[PDB]
Amino acid sequence: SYFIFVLGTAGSGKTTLVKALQDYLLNNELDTAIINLDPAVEVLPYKPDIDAREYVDVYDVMNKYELGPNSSLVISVDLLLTKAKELKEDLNQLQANYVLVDTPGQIELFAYRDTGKILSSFISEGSKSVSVFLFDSYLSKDPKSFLSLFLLSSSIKFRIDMPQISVLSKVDLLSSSELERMRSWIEDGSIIDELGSIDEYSFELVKTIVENLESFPIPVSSTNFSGLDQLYAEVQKVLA
Amino acid sequence: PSYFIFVLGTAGSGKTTLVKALQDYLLNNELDTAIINLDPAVEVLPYKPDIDAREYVDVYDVMNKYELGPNSSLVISVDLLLTKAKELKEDLNQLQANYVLVDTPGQIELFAYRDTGKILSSFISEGSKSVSVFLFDSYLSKDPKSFLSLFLLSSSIKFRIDMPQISVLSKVDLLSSSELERMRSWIEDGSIIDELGSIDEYSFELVKTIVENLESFPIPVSSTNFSGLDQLYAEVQKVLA
Ligand SMILES: Nc1nc2c(ncn2[C@@H]2O[C@H](COP(=O)(O)OP(=O)(O)O)[C@@H](O)[C@H]2O)c(=O)[nH]1
Ligand SMILES: Nc1nc2c(ncn2[C@@H]2O[C@H](COP(=O)(O)OP(=O)(O)O)[C@@H](O)[C@H]2O)c(=O)[nH]1
Ligand SMILES: [Mg+2]
Ligand SMILES: [Mg+2]
């Protein structure tokens, strides 16, 4: 069994990539299941084999405790730890070599809460796991926001202790010219010239990123169905 | 002379409680401070806000008007504050205070990594100096790897919210004196390198850059013990000068 964890900011394309990656993998004759760990997602574009909404009803939490949407979201994600026993039980009943794991919409509720570390380590126990972090192309158009995503993706890795592949998601929102500037920003280091006013600390952080980064984030577009061959190949290399 | 203090941090790291404690410290020193709450989904507030986002955007109205769930409604509700920005500054100018405490939404992601955050933060503090305060949750900081993840997160937020940022170690009453001293030596002396296990070269070079270039340890503050607020305000003043 192989576990692929899809991470990223809200609306960065996690859920859509899970459906698009599943279609690519099933088209290439690999049986993949999907676990949805978002107990508050309204509409899913795929058929999840395990649905967190079947374990924790965020609407039940709202009125049982008389809390608002924000508190209920935090409480609902935390309740997944109490339902982890059933989660791993339903894992063994699925027989697939690859398992895609869709995470809650807000990565903060997953990575920076103990539920994230425990659940991800508990369900991938005895299996190989890899995480995929989505760089929102819309956020990456600005060089400072682009660099903030690199620091964010590095932060998540320190919380979720598993290898992480970087993906530039929703890349169809970019022109060929926009990608070339973003590519040269990191591959050459020209983002230094277009960085505005920085403190020495943050400037030293950017220096470390550009000079020590091994590869650019994989440009993927779930709607154009592009980059999934590169993403799958990078997943394979990590899993070896 | 109006000063805006934006309080940031992970969910449950103590932003709202610190806003009350900071207001209490400033009022004890006879400094007229107002509070803006920008969280449209908070149930109970421990302070009395001069501007409340819940009076401009009703998150429950958004839920059934749009027929969406809590997650989507939260995102839309935070975004709707931009439609109410005209009214927002109108009620702000009615305040004459030297310090304006800004309480942000519970999830820092909904604020920092959404375009609403910078626009709101830049719009209401127009014509004034602003400083940001990022809360390091002490409970998360007990683990050396999670501690470092907070340093990378706080640095990421600074690249999104373009204003000076003061780092605070919040909820420090959850730590023993020994735990706090170990966390200080972890970063100030670099001994955290030894307590990192085996990590990739990229992450290791990032840790090195943090330890060797960090200017100061985060200010240990405890809102429940009402400690460290003298250090925070002094650092706020030094930045605002
Ligand atoms: N252009 C483009 N839009 C996308 C892509 N993937 C997702 N989206 C859109 O982005 C919005 C949010 O995506 P979603 O899958 O919900 O991201 P999530 O919240 O992280 O799970 C949806 O309305 C999608 O239509 C993509 O590859 N390209
Ligand atoms: N022990 C301790 N608990 C705190 C402190 N500040 C806040 N809390 C608790 O942390 C929880 C979340 O605090 P809150 O201010 O709402 O966090 P926020 O989401 O960032 O606004 C609350 O239950 C508080 O009681 C503190 O200084 N010490
Ligand atoms: Mg989703
Ligand atoms: Mg709060």
Chain B contact set for A144 (CB, 8 A): 159-160, 162
Experimental method: X-ray
Residue A213's identity, in one-letter code, is L
B33 bridge partner residues: B99
The Cα–Cα gap between B84 and B80 comes to 7
The Cα–Cα gap between B51 and B239 comes to 25
Please give the C-alpha separations between residue A76 and each of A73, A116, B59, in angstroms, as whole numbers. 5, 12, 18
A129 bridge partner residues: A3
**Residue B192 per-residue DSSP state:** G
Neighbours of B70 (CB within 10 A): 25
- Alpha helices by DSSP H, listed for chain B, are 15-28, 59-66, 70-80, 85-93, 108-112, 115-124, 138-141, 144-160, 177-188, 201-213, 229-240
The Cα–Cα gap between B111 and B165 comes to 15
Cβ proximity of B18 and B46 under 8 Å: no
Token pair for residue B10?
A: 């992970």
Cβ proximity of A146 and A182 under 8 Å: yes
The Cα–Cα gap between B172 and B179 comes to 10
Query: Quick one: which of B188, B168, B182 has its CA closest to B232?
Result: B168
Cα A144 to ligand 3 centroid, rounded to whole Å: 25
Query: Quick one: which of A42, A65, A16 has its CA closest to B63?
Result: A42
Cβ-defined contact of B106 to A72 (cutoff 8 Å): no
Beta strands per DSSP E along A32-176? 32-36, 50-51, 98-102, 128-136, 164-169
Cβ proximity of A55 and A61 under 8 Å: no
> How many residues can be counted in chain A?
240
Residue A92 Cα, gap to closest chain B Cα (Å): 30
| Parallel, antiparallel or unpaired: strands B219-220 and A98-102 | unpaired
Cβ proximity of A46 and A19 under 8 Å: yes
Counting Cβ atoms within 10 Å, is residue A228 exposed (0-12), middle (13-18) or buried (19+)?
A: buried
- Residues in contact with A48: Cβ distance below 8 Å, sequence separation at least 6, in sequence order: A34, A35, A36, A102
Cβ-defined contact of A11 to B149 (cutoff 8 Å): no
Domain B3-137+162-172+218-240: give its CATH code: 3.40.50.300
- Feature table: binding site of A for Mg(2+): 15
**Lateral strand order in the sheet of B51-52:** B51-52, B33-37, B99-103, B3-9, B129-137, B165-170, B219-220
Chain A contact set for B122 (CB, 8 A): none
Cβ proximity of A54 and A69 under 8 Å: no
The Cα–Cα gap between B173 and B181 comes to 13
The Cα–Cα gap between A69 and B60 comes to 8
Distance from the Cα of residue A135 to its chain's centroid:
9
Q: What sign does the dihedral B170-B175-B181-B183 (CA atoms) show?
A: negative
Cβ proximity of A141 and A174 under 8 Å: yes
Token pair for residue B105?
A: 């939404």
Chain A contact set for B157 (CB, 8 A): 148
As for ligand 2, residues whose beta carbon falls within 6 Å of it are B 9, 11-17, 106, 171, 173-174, 222-224
What 3 state SS string does A21-73 have? HHHHHHHCCCCEEEEECCCCCCCCCCCCCEEHHHCCCHHHHHHHHCCCHHHHH
The gap between the terminal CA atoms of chain B, to the nearest Å, is: 12
B12 assigned binding-site residue: yes
Residue with tokens 């992601």: B109
Neighbours of B189 (CB within 10 A): 10
Token pair for residue A67?
A: 């809390």
Cβ proximity of B131 and B236 under 8 Å: yes
Counting Cβ atoms within 10 Å, is residue B36 exposed (0-12), middle (13-18) or buried (19+)?
A: buried
Token pair for residue B20?
A: 């009350």
Cα B199 to ligand 3 centroid, rounded to whole Å: 29
Helix (H, G, I), strand (E, B) or coil at B198: coil
Q: What sign does the dihedral B223-A113-B51-B5 (CA atoms) show?
A: positive
**In chain A, which residues are last before a break of more than 2.5 Å from C to the next N?**
none
B117 assigned binding-site residue: no
The reply to whether ligand 1 has any atom less than 6 angstroms from the CB of A72 is: no
B131 bridge partner residues: B5
Atom of ligand 1 nearest to the CA of A221: 27
Element (H, E) at A218: strand A218-219
Please give the C-alpha separations between residue A109 and each of A116, A205, B79, B197, B223, in angstroms, as whole numbers. 8, 25, 19, 25, 23
Token pair for residue A61?
A: 């939490």
Find the closest chain A residue to B75 by CA distance. Answer: A10
> How many residues can be counted in chain B?
241
The gap between the terminal CA atoms of chain A, to the nearest Å, is: 13
Second-level CATH architecture of A2-137+161-171+217-239: 3-Layer(aba) Sandwich (3.40)
